[PDB]
């Protein structure tokens, strides 16, 4: 078991071609660990504001100061979580965002392979670290699997067969699992890229008003990692086994945005239900972490509840037990796309919500007058003393 240390991160991407073509305006402003956003239609009352454990400004590409470089975010999250994985405990990454905000980017990176997202840095450090560490007295095994959740049904991507539904089960000792789920071994990150592309081609996608290509289902990319030791004895044993779950969440949906009827509304409803269940479990885990840390009196077991949706059900080993969780939320900079960003921040504000506030400074002339008066008081003191 380990403390449910959940890391909340948000990142703002730059402009795209269409947004640059229009006379759009940036509305997200960051400072320390707080981000604030304004209304184009209501610029009088106040900006709304949120606080997260990490705020990342990848807006200005050529900027040199406080730029959230991809190596930086990898150092923040992926290095520590790979270190946790090598200890033999499970690791989970959740990628969330709405078409445009910039999810894939953070997960994959550019195509020129010069600025790498979370996946290449993690995988290459895993492979490279092992290749430059393995010895006669140790063996390492790595496998990969890729599945999707759609309308509370599990479907396989790597297998090219007829896409029939599979059946979730629950081995008494090993926990939940899926029958007939294809599992393959990999040697280097090129193999993972090939499998990932092949699987991504098989995902279900539908067009909507927001974008022509919108995710209609969650995806789970599991990396099974096993270490075996050859001690100076006839008994050769597996030291421990760990799992890395890289997860793609479909964005929250609103008929006030996707006006399609029929199957399209049903998919959105199921997506929203799954997202609500996920937030419900994640916040409870953070509360579980927080309680005994403060008062030493663990809150019994607050028995967390996963058997509510298939997504949280399959990932039971990764959220709970001895494991760590980290989440990144993409945000788009168009003044036009307000409520998408508002909803993304609101749903990102869960999972150990951080206290947020505003500052507001004072009229510069008044500050100058106050400084002059303070100097005069000191000098009058320089005269009195």
């Amino acid at each position: 078991m380990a403390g449910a240390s959940v890391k909340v991160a948000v990142r703002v991407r730059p402009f795209n071609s269409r947004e640059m073509s229009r006379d759009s305006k940036c509305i997200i402003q960051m400072s320390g660990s707080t981000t604030t956003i304004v209304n184009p239609k209501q610029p009088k009352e106040t900006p709304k504001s949120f606080s997260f454990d990490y705020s990342y400004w990848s807006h200005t590409s050529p900027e040199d100061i406080n730029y959230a470089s991809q190596k930086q975010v990898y150092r923040d999250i992926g290095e520590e979580m790979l270190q946790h994985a090598f200890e033999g405990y499970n690791v989970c990454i959740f990628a969330y965002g709405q078409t445009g905000a910039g999810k894939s980017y953070t997960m994959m990176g550019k195509q020129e392979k010069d600025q790498q997202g979370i996946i290449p840095q993690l995988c290459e450090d895993l492979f490279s670290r092992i290749n430059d560490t393995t010895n006669d007295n140790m063996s390492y095994s790595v496998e990969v699997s890729y599945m999707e959740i759609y309308c509370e049904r599990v479907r396989d991507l790597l297998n090219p067969k007829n896409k029939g539904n599979l059946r979730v089960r629950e081995h008494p000792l090993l926990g939940p699992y899926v029958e007939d789920l294809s599992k393959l071994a990999v040697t280097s990150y090129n193999d993972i890229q090939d499998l990932m592309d092949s699987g991504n081609k098989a995902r279900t996608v539908a067009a909507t008003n927001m974008n022509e290509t919108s995710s209609r289902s969650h995806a789970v990319f599991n990396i099974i990692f096993t270490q075996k030791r050859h001690d100076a004895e006839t008994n050769i044993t597996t030291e421990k086994v760990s799992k890395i779950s890289l997860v793609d969440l479909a964005g929250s949906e609103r008929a006030d945005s996707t006006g399609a009827k029929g199957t399209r509304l049903k998919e959105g409803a199921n997506i929203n239900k799954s997202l609500t269940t996920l937030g419900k479990v994640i916040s409870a885990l953070a509360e579980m972490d927080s309680g005994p840390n403060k008062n030493k009196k663990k809150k019994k077991t607050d028995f967390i509840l996963y058997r509510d949706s298939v997504l949280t059900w399959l990932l039971r080993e990764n959220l709970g037990g001895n494991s760590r969780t980290a989440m990144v939320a993409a945000l788009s900079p168009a003044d036009i796309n307000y409520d998408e960003t508002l909803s993304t921040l609101r749903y990102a504000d869960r999972a150990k919500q951080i206290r947020c506030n505003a500052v507001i400074n004072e009229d510069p002339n008044n500050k100058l007058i106050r400084e002059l008066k303070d100097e005069v008081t000191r000098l009058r003191d320089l005269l009195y003393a």
Binding site: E170, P172, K297, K300, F303, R307, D308
Partner: protein, 433 residues
């Protein structure tokens, strides 16, 4: 137009369905031959909820009867209301399951399910705007539990937006008429927890207790128990059929009664009950109905509600009455027994009023409670199930029909989680740690 399709599987479900159709036919004034010989005008206003119209002003119900032995079909056809049903809906096979869950759900039922589904689709497509389904069955038997769960699964897969109900007779603590009951009850509850929106829990022991103590009957028989259950079933869906001052469909009860998706096991009840030869002493008023309705000894679930807390309650009244009396009485019930209501729901009593009371009762009321005490039933079943599973009492009869031991374990785990989830919202405070 809110149409309900009615299904019934097994001996228990068939008998209860027969009695229920006899009751409803009396309510709407339909003769056994199928013609209408009623008096009031409102009876035909909403007859299409349960009945279809034939050629010569003859009505036919939407019943679908299922079994794996022809004995009960023959019994129902040779009965007072045998000829009202459609002949083409009598689906059956031979060499029934025989109290074996595996035979009902994996081997024998797999052949009849296609025909049953064809009939169900045919009946459903003809409706104007289907609302939901029903299913009467018993969990302690083979055909009932197995075929009912399979039908529920398939229909839920096919029609995912409509409301599925079910009236299930749970195994009793003490009175037992089968030996392999706990396996069937557990391997089943495992499906009912997943594929159903509302379940009403019935138990023979509670009904026998009502008959012996309240009604004062000396020789209860299964007809009486079917009577009680049928009265409740008629009471639940009243607001679809008759006008009133505050309506409540099945979906409104679903929305108001269920806080979380996996907590939909209800304790039903009905008032009043004068036991006869004592009507002249008891004055019938709304406070008397509310008093009898909440009594612990009136429930049909064989659970003591005083051992837990009421997550939510619903009361459907039928008659001409004042709304102030109803609201004040529900408020008084909530205040005087504040220990037995959860604190984080500020008000947890839904109320509905209908204008047309039953045949010969100035007033009536039906009760749908949702409390944590129901967990006891599941716990009791587990306390038997493991006692038979540690040493594999009657397992070879189940594995001989193709069922891996894992399926058994994957279930004892699911019901145990259900008991734990109910146990969470049961303690009457939560602070400190």
């Amino acid at each position: 137009m809110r149409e309900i399709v009615h299904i019934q599987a097994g001996q228990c479900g068939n008998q209860i369905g027969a009695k229920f159709w006899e009751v409803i036919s009396d309510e709407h004034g339909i003769d056994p031959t199928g013609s209408y010989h009623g008096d009031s005008d409102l009876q035909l206003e909403r007859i299409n909820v349960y009945y279809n119209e034939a050629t010569g002003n003859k009505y036919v119900p939407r019943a679908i009867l299922v079994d794996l032995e022809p004995g009960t079909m023959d019994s129902v056809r040779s009965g007072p209301f045998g000829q009202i049903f459609r002949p083409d809906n009598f689906v059956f096979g031979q060499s029934g399951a025989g109290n074996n869950w595996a035979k009902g759900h994996y081997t024998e039922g797999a052949e009849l399910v296609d025909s049953v589904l064809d009939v169900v689709r045919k009946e459903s497509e003809s409706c104007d705007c289907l609302q939901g389904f029903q299913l009467t069955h018993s969990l302690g038997g083979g055909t009932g539990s197995g075929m009912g769960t399979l039908l529920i699964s398939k229909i839920r897969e096919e029609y995912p937006d409509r409301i599925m109900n079910t009236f299930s007779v749970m195994p009793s603590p003490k009175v037992s008429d089968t030996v392999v009951e706990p396996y069937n009850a557990t391997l089943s509850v495992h499906q009912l927890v997943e594929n159903t929106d509302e379940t009403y829990c019935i138990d023979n022991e509670a009904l026998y207790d009502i008959c012996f103590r309240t009604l004062k009957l000396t020789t209860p028989t299964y007809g009486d128990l079917n009577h009680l259950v049928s009265a409740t079933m008629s009471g639940v869906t009243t607001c679809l059929r008759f006008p009133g001052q505050l309506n409540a469909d099945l979906r409104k009860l679903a929305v108001n009664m269920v806080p979380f998706p996996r907590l939909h096991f209800f304790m039903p009840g009905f008032a009043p009950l004068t036991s006869r030869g004592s009507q002249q002493y008891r004055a019938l008023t709304v406070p008397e109905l509310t008093q009898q309705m909440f009594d612990s000894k009136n429930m049909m679930a064989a659970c003591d509600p005083r051992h837990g807390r009421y997550l939510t309650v619903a009361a459907i009244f039928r008659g001409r009455m004042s709304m102030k009396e109803v609201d004040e009485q529900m408020l008084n019930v909530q205040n005087k027994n504040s220990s037995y209501f959860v604190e984080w729901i500020p008000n947890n009593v839904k109320t509905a009023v209908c204008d047309i009371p039953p045949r010969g009762l100035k007033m009536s009321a039906t009760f749908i409670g949702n409390s944590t005490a129901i967990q006891e039933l599941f716990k009791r079943i587990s306390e038997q199930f493991t006692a038979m599973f540690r040493r594999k009492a009657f397992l070879h009869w189940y594995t001989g029909e193709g069922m891996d031991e894992m399926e058994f374990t994957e279930a004892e785990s699911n019901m145990n989680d259900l008991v734990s989830e109910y146990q969470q919202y049961q303690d009457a405070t939560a602070d400190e740690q």
